[PDB]
Every structure is written in C-alpha cells, then in structure tokens.
C-alpha cells in the first residue's frame, strides 16, 4: 500500500484462550491472583491478549441465579481482577473477558427465552468496559436466537466505548454458508469456528478452504483457529501440529490458540482429564492424580530447554508474527505447487517477504512452485533464505534454491527474501 496501517492491538499477534483457571494454573491457585503468576510465561509466548473465563456467577440453567456482573468467589474478587488487568497491561498483554452466560450448563444461552439473557450481556459490557477490559468473547452463538442482531448491538456498545476494544464470537459450526451469515450484519467481528477443523486433509483442500474464506470475506480482517475453544490436538494428529502452527502464524489475520497448544497439550494423553479443560503441564509434578505419569517432554519446563520442541517453535513463530510487517499486515497470495502442498507469500510494500511451503502429505515431495500469477513486485527469487523448518536437518539462515525445493513428509518451511533482487 505504501501507507502504514494504524493497526489495532489484536492485529499484532496471537490471542490465547484460558477457559479454565484451575486447570491452567493447577491445585491451590485456580483464581485470578494466581494467573498474575503466569503473566511472565505468557509474555514469553508474545501473545497479545488473553481470553479469560467465563468467571461469573452461573447457577447451572438458572437465569435468575446467573449474574454476569459478579465474579464467582472461587476465582477471587473484583480487586483481584483489577490487579490482574493492571499487571497484564504492564506486560503489553490485553484481557478479553468471556461472558457466555450459562457456561456451566449445556445450552450456553439458556432455553428460557433470550431478551432477559441478552440484557444480562448488554448490562455486563458497560460494567466491565468501565473496569478496563479490552474486550469480550461469547461462544456457541449458533445457539443464540437472533445472533447477528445481538452481536451487532454488543459490538457497537464495545466500539462506542473505545475503538481499541473488541468483540470475539465463537461458533461450533464448520459451515461457511452459516459462518458468512453470522458475519453479514457484523463487519468488525472476529469469529472463531470449526471451519478449518474439517481439515485433517490434503494441501489442496486446506488451500481451497483458506482461499474460499478469504475471497468470501473481502478485505476484512480474519481470525484463524481450528475451533472456538478446543485444543489443536482435538483435531490434528501429532505429525501435523507443527505444520498448523506455521500456517496459523503466517495466514493473514489474528491466530487464536487455547492454552496448551504451544506444548501440544493433548487431553487424551493422560487418563481422566476433561477434554473440556485439560490440566496444564508446567512440569512433571503438574499431574498429581497419577504421580509419575508426566514425562519432561510433555511439559513447559522440559520443552523450554529443548530448541527442537513445539514450545520453541511456537515462541519463534510468535516472535516473527508480531514483529515483521509482511506478517503483521502484508498481502497474501497462494500459488500452484505440487500434489500435497500448500504454498503462499506474505508481502507488505518493500518489506522482507515470507514464503511459506506446507507439505500436508505423508510422502516427501518436490515443491514444484509455479508462481506465474504472483504480482511482479513480490515475484519469486532464484533463492531465498531459510528462516526455519518444522523439522531438523536444514541449515537455517542459508539460501535454498527454490526450483530444487523438496519437502519431507509433513514438513513446513518458512523462507524469506527482500524486495527486488
């Protein structure tokens, strides 16, 4: 564009969902105060906002006994919330509060009708906005009668308070047509879904999903996630976790993860552990129900010390995503590659371009990159420098000849090249 975007905070990197304070922090400190103790960790992830809760009083399926202005005392006090907000802001981490009303029940929106419940949400937005929250999330919106109307209203209350706040909506739907109807009356909404979840599939299929979505939504700013709540490991085999991290951190828009995504936390790796809220594995003492079962490589502490870990990959990708202009706000052009491949470039003005090449298949593949329809200003050079691969054995920092590019099974590559030459 040759004129620099005034980006919102949520364009500048990943959002990180913490839906269970107890499970995330562990026994003894499943409260708002305890979360402050994890802000240095979250800061090391370079995440730009935390999506917290819900944390409000909610008697299961009891509209009268549900109050979105009151914190459930199990999670602490309003002062604790105030102090968390303040420490978070200090570390450049913004806070989004999830206000999904009947979050302890099965229908998040209650079965008894909507206006009294939607009024609860409305009154709560003004209250929490004055307390200084940077925004809100509401999930399961497919279950909200008149969702597009209520979302527009709630978005307008939020943006009316300040342009630097936002509303995120989550849905269980994987249907593009249903998803686009939700975004119809709602231009400024980030919406998470299962649209990409469906992809445990080929590179051509993932490519078509991504480009279908981008073309349907025009120039609006997207989110990229595999679900509105669930772990990546709910949907992807281990062999694909790295590839998807690379993809989500390089697609145009805001990536959204759930706590544990950065370590490949898998709810089914450990007996008895809610798919809902798996216990966050800080170290080998983090699962005391079966003492001895957690091994170092499943933990934050073990993964931090290993440059080869998922966590180390997540941190490097997050760093790139939050500092490089072509990743922050560059255009996206996908192009023709070989059979199991999905390849694209991110490019902003004359800033360093990024080429992403993703092999979704279980066979080694020649990339056979065919540009031809790329813009001239971003065309492919003969060689680009390898920034990283999801697998070992490459010389990072040295140039690869693009014509001879070959990928290992499931390997993702991140390459960069300058404007011109």
XYZ file of C-alpha atoms in Angstrom:
421
model
C 0.000 0.000 0.000
C 2.907 2.429 0.692
C 0.906 3.952 3.587
C 1.353 2.333 7.024
C -1.712 0.814 8.797
C -2.816 2.106 12.210
C -3.144 -1.452 13.483
C -5.287 -2.489 16.403
C -3.624 -4.411 19.220
C -5.286 -7.666 18.196
C -3.812 -7.486 14.652
C -0.312 -7.594 16.149
C -0.155 -11.250 17.239
C -1.855 -14.263 18.816
C -4.755 -14.464 21.254
C -4.548 -17.178 23.888
C -7.653 -18.724 25.365
C -7.741 -19.640 29.082
C -11.154 -21.204 29.637
C -10.397 -22.988 32.948
C -8.320 -21.044 35.504
C -7.978 -24.061 37.770
C -6.748 -26.419 35.030
C -4.375 -23.785 33.594
C -2.723 -22.892 36.898
C -3.259 -26.054 38.979
C -4.349 -27.076 42.526
C -4.309 -24.226 45.106
C -4.225 -21.284 42.678
C -7.195 -21.613 40.363
C -8.011 -17.917 40.860
C -7.357 -14.510 39.250
C -4.455 -13.735 41.598
C -2.665 -16.936 40.605
C -2.920 -16.032 36.919
C -0.701 -12.983 37.544
C 1.963 -15.501 38.415
C 1.778 -16.796 34.803
C 1.986 -13.435 33.007
C 5.771 -13.703 32.598
C 5.219 -17.052 30.880
C 2.547 -15.653 28.585
C 4.806 -12.717 27.843
C 7.482 -15.222 26.695
C 4.904 -16.555 24.205
C 4.466 -12.981 22.855
C 0.656 -13.436 22.962
C -1.207 -10.114 22.613
C -4.337 -10.937 24.558
C -5.716 -13.466 26.975
C -9.297 -14.679 26.551
C -10.376 -15.356 30.112
C -13.246 -17.305 31.605
C -16.127 -17.097 31.902
C -15.717 -16.299 35.609
C -19.135 -15.029 36.551
C -21.761 -16.415 38.883
C -23.773 -19.030 36.980
C -26.138 -21.456 38.651
C -26.498 -24.150 36.015
C -29.508 -23.356 33.803
C -30.932 -20.807 36.261
C -31.374 -17.416 34.596
C -32.348 -15.688 37.865
C -29.347 -17.277 39.618
C -26.880 -16.141 36.968
C -25.144 -12.761 37.244
C -22.523 -11.600 34.766
C -21.640 -8.573 36.968
C -20.464 -10.861 39.818
C -17.268 -12.916 39.820
C -17.752 -16.445 41.115
C -15.904 -16.261 44.501
C -13.948 -19.396 43.633
C -11.941 -17.288 41.186
C -11.363 -14.329 43.544
C -12.542 -10.742 43.950
C -13.070 -7.707 41.764
C -9.850 -6.270 43.270
C -8.030 -9.390 42.061
C -9.429 -8.859 38.606
C -8.350 -5.173 38.720
C -4.815 -6.133 39.785
C -4.594 -8.856 37.073
C -5.653 -6.326 34.436
C -3.071 -3.855 35.643
C -0.179 -6.402 35.599
C -1.263 -7.683 32.232
C -1.356 -4.198 30.686
C 2.077 -3.571 32.184
C 3.369 -6.549 30.170
C 1.563 -5.406 26.982
C -0.983 -8.156 27.327
C -4.592 -7.234 26.868
C -7.525 -9.018 28.520
C -10.722 -10.273 26.856
C -13.499 -11.488 29.138
C -15.715 -14.344 28.059
C -19.351 -13.636 29.046
C -21.017 -16.739 27.620
C -23.925 -16.746 30.122
C -24.833 -20.346 31.037
C -21.312 -21.648 30.645
C -21.816 -24.211 33.419
C -24.804 -25.694 31.578
C -25.445 -27.379 28.246
C -27.225 -24.581 26.366
C -24.836 -21.641 26.894
C -27.712 -19.287 26.057
C -30.343 -20.918 28.304
C -33.547 -22.476 26.887
C -35.845 -19.894 28.551
C -36.016 -17.012 26.163
C -33.462 -14.612 25.046
C -34.145 -10.934 25.813
C -33.668 -11.209 29.600
C -30.450 -13.194 28.951
C -29.240 -10.822 26.193
C -29.997 -7.921 28.535
C -27.653 -9.545 31.075
C -24.848 -9.499 28.472
C -25.601 -5.880 27.474
C -25.521 -4.524 31.071
C -22.352 -6.503 31.743
C -20.471 -4.997 28.750
C -20.804 -1.433 30.147
C -19.748 -2.580 33.656
C -16.614 -4.490 32.533
C -15.679 -1.825 29.976
C -15.549 0.761 32.833
C -13.377 -1.764 34.784
C -10.956 -1.670 31.857
C -11.325 -4.968 29.973
C -10.004 -4.790 26.428
C -12.956 -6.765 25.051
C -15.268 -9.763 25.209
C -15.941 -13.221 23.845
C -19.238 -15.005 23.508
C -19.256 -18.652 22.413
C -21.805 -21.126 20.978
C -23.529 -18.272 19.126
C -25.232 -20.788 16.798
C -27.431 -21.402 19.847
C -28.313 -17.685 20.231
C -31.630 -16.790 18.588
C -31.047 -13.632 16.521
C -27.280 -13.936 16.912
C -26.330 -11.499 14.111
C -28.552 -8.781 15.658
C -27.286 -9.263 19.233
C -23.671 -9.427 18.060
C -24.016 -6.173 16.098
C -25.508 -4.456 19.147
C -22.821 -5.791 21.513
C -20.063 -4.875 19.024
C -21.470 -1.319 18.853
C -21.547 -0.966 22.664
C -17.917 -2.147 22.752
C -16.624 0.033 19.902
C -18.653 3.027 21.134
C -16.735 2.786 24.408
C -13.447 2.668 22.508
C -12.165 1.718 19.036
C -9.356 -0.149 20.789
C -11.731 -2.742 22.286
C -13.332 -5.710 20.581
C -15.846 -8.483 20.480
C -14.960 -12.079 19.507
C -17.725 -14.551 18.746
C -17.245 -18.302 18.722
C -19.315 -20.930 16.949
C -19.366 -24.758 16.769
C -20.316 -24.524 13.096
C -17.947 -25.705 10.359
C -20.268 -24.408 7.644
C -19.001 -21.490 5.536
C -22.523 -20.503 4.473
C -23.676 -20.416 8.093
C -20.487 -18.666 9.146
C -20.871 -15.939 6.480
C -24.494 -15.270 7.551
C -23.130 -14.626 11.075
C -20.597 -12.100 9.644
C -23.231 -10.479 7.430
C -24.569 -7.821 9.803
C -21.245 -7.783 11.648
C -18.302 -6.161 9.797
C -15.877 -5.746 12.685
C -16.355 -9.133 14.390
C -13.642 -11.737 14.844
C -15.370 -15.112 14.588
C -13.832 -18.471 15.565
C -15.294 -21.680 14.232
C -14.561 -25.288 13.259
C -14.237 -24.334 9.555
C -10.581 -25.462 9.396
C -11.194 -28.356 11.832
C -12.670 -30.398 8.968
C -9.083 -30.229 7.593
C -7.395 -33.430 8.602
C -6.864 -33.461 4.835
C -4.651 -32.700 1.767
C -2.797 -29.441 0.989
C -5.036 -28.686 -1.985
C -8.071 -28.982 0.306
C -6.599 -26.728 3.018
C -5.662 -24.249 0.297
C -9.178 -24.183 -1.116
C -10.724 -23.711 2.393
C -8.383 -20.817 3.210
C -8.795 -19.030 -0.159
C -12.580 -19.671 -0.342
C -12.791 -17.996 3.075
C -10.586 -15.008 2.241
C -12.389 -14.375 -1.067
C -15.838 -14.544 0.608
C -14.895 -12.084 3.340
C -13.333 -9.456 1.023
C -10.707 -7.200 2.675
C -11.894 -7.683 6.266
C -9.548 -8.849 8.994
C -9.984 -12.555 9.792
C -9.267 -14.836 12.667
C -7.614 -18.198 12.149
C -8.321 -21.031 14.521
C -9.313 -24.727 14.452
C -12.128 -24.271 16.983
C -13.882 -21.712 19.207
C -12.373 -23.419 22.312
C -10.869 -26.858 21.754
C -7.205 -27.811 21.562
C -5.460 -28.327 18.193
C -4.802 -31.890 19.392
C -8.591 -32.453 19.435
C -8.490 -32.372 15.607
C -4.902 -32.962 14.451
C -2.548 -35.959 14.779
C 0.845 -35.143 16.357
C 2.506 -35.295 12.947
C 0.554 -32.132 11.848
C 0.793 -29.847 14.912
C 3.945 -28.105 13.771
C 2.642 -27.553 10.256
C -0.556 -25.945 11.564
C 1.343 -23.731 13.956
C 3.393 -22.443 10.999
C 0.255 -21.920 8.906
C -1.767 -20.112 11.637
C 1.115 -17.770 12.457
C 1.549 -16.806 8.791
C -2.005 -16.567 7.453
C -3.442 -13.032 7.112
C -5.358 -12.262 10.298
C -5.273 -12.992 14.011
C -4.365 -16.504 15.137
C -6.283 -17.917 18.115
C -4.999 -20.712 20.304
C -6.086 -22.333 23.540
C -3.781 -22.832 26.485
C -1.552 -25.830 25.948
C -1.480 -25.507 22.125
C 2.092 -24.286 22.453
C 3.185 -27.593 24.044
C 0.907 -29.920 22.074
C -1.189 -30.493 25.182
C -3.402 -33.485 24.394
C -6.401 -34.201 26.616
C -6.247 -37.912 25.693
C -2.500 -38.340 26.537
C -3.334 -38.850 30.219
C -6.221 -40.861 31.736
C -9.119 -38.927 33.301
C -8.834 -35.296 32.247
C -11.625 -33.179 30.790
C -11.401 -32.777 27.037
C -13.111 -29.606 28.250
C -10.206 -28.383 30.436
C -7.035 -30.487 30.457
C -4.509 -29.878 33.191
C -1.698 -27.604 32.026
C 1.595 -29.442 32.233
C 4.088 -26.964 33.774
C 6.402 -29.686 34.936
C 6.423 -33.354 35.980
C 4.721 -32.501 39.281
C 1.735 -30.955 37.368
C -0.442 -34.101 37.316
C -0.563 -35.371 40.905
C -3.627 -37.658 40.341
C -1.289 -40.138 38.678
C 2.113 -39.237 40.118
C 4.941 -40.427 37.830
C 2.981 -40.352 34.532
C 4.062 -36.944 33.171
C 7.417 -37.007 31.397
C 9.656 -33.965 30.809
C 8.929 -33.754 27.104
C 5.198 -33.186 27.782
C 5.924 -30.098 29.930
C 6.641 -26.398 29.599
C 9.780 -26.803 31.662
C 11.107 -29.720 29.529
C 10.093 -28.138 26.234
C 11.672 -24.700 27.084
C 15.082 -26.284 27.438
C 14.786 -28.092 24.073
C 15.315 -25.932 20.979
C 13.598 -28.724 18.996
C 10.308 -28.551 20.944
C 6.853 -27.435 19.946
C 7.101 -24.661 22.520
C 10.407 -23.400 20.998
C 8.726 -23.397 17.553
C 5.697 -21.577 18.928
C 7.862 -18.860 20.518
C 9.879 -18.310 17.302
C 6.798 -18.168 15.123
C 5.057 -15.793 17.553
C 8.103 -13.520 17.545
C 8.131 -13.355 13.688
C 4.384 -12.794 13.555
C 4.461 -9.862 15.975
C 7.453 -8.024 14.513
C 7.597 -8.497 10.695
C 5.444 -6.118 8.668
C 4.687 -8.647 5.897
C 3.299 -10.969 8.605
C 1.598 -8.176 10.589
C -0.236 -6.709 7.582
C 1.120 -7.991 4.276
C -0.998 -9.184 1.379
C -1.394 -12.939 0.852
C -1.006 -14.742 -2.497
C -1.359 -18.513 -2.719
C 0.012 -20.208 -5.778
C 0.260 -23.537 -7.572
C 2.616 -26.113 -6.004
C 2.913 -29.937 -6.183
C 0.348 -32.602 -5.025
C 0.173 -32.448 -1.197
C 1.423 -28.864 -0.917
C 0.018 -25.518 0.134
C 2.288 -22.593 -0.647
C 1.887 -18.809 -0.287
C 3.689 -15.473 0.134
C 3.108 -12.660 2.627
C 4.315 -9.262 1.407
C 3.987 -5.654 2.524
C 5.312 -2.790 0.454
C 9.123 -3.133 0.223
C 9.488 -5.118 3.426
C 11.006 -8.589 3.644
C 8.705 -11.125 2.055
C 7.874 -14.510 3.585
C 7.310 -17.689 1.550
C 5.541 -20.499 3.374
C 5.578 -24.012 1.885
C 3.481 -26.671 3.670
C 3.540 -30.436 2.910
C 0.379 -31.949 4.372
C 1.197 -35.411 2.944
C 2.991 -38.406 4.389
C 5.383 -38.629 1.426
C 8.438 -36.499 0.625
C 7.569 -34.087 -2.179
C 9.157 -31.822 -4.733
C 7.594 -28.418 -4.182
C 7.392 -27.539 -7.894
C 6.456 -23.949 -7.066
C 4.654 -22.336 -10.009
C 4.202 -18.579 -9.491
C 3.217 -17.039 -12.879
C 0.196 -15.148 -11.369
C 2.112 -13.521 -8.461
C 2.423 -9.700 -8.558
C 5.695 -8.517 -10.118
C 6.779 -6.570 -7.018
C 6.659 -9.777 -4.928
C 7.751 -12.376 -7.553
C 9.926 -15.346 -6.531
C 13.703 -15.034 -6.493
C 16.036 -17.898 -7.504
C 16.974 -18.458 -3.859
C 15.522 -17.401 -0.540
C 16.973 -17.657 2.948
C 15.622 -20.379 5.173
C 14.349 -18.878 8.408
C 13.039 -22.134 9.762
C 11.661 -25.589 9.075
C 9.361 -27.553 11.386
C 11.878 -30.421 11.149
C 15.650 -30.671 11.751
C 18.406 -31.206 9.223
C 18.276 -27.890 7.347
C 20.817 -25.059 7.641
C 18.688 -22.220 8.928
C 19.972 -18.829 7.784
C 21.263 -20.087 4.433
C 19.594 -19.731 0.989
C 17.624 -22.520 -0.708
C 17.300 -22.736 -4.495
C 13.510 -22.560 -4.926
C 13.433 -24.650 -8.146
C 15.033 -27.617 -6.352
C 12.891 -27.318 -3.233
C 11.899 -30.706 -1.802
C 9.916 -31.257 1.431
C 9.983 -34.198 3.879
C 6.669 -35.788 4.971
C 4.630 -33.242 6.959
C 7.437 -30.634 6.745
C 6.665 -26.886 6.797
C 9.179 -24.300 5.554
C 9.362 -20.569 6.291
C 11.614 -18.704 3.860
C 12.243 -15.015 3.408
C 13.538 -12.729 0.702
C 13.970 -8.987 0.195
C 12.102 -6.630 -2.075
C 13.738 -6.519 -5.557
C 16.804 -8.720 -6.319
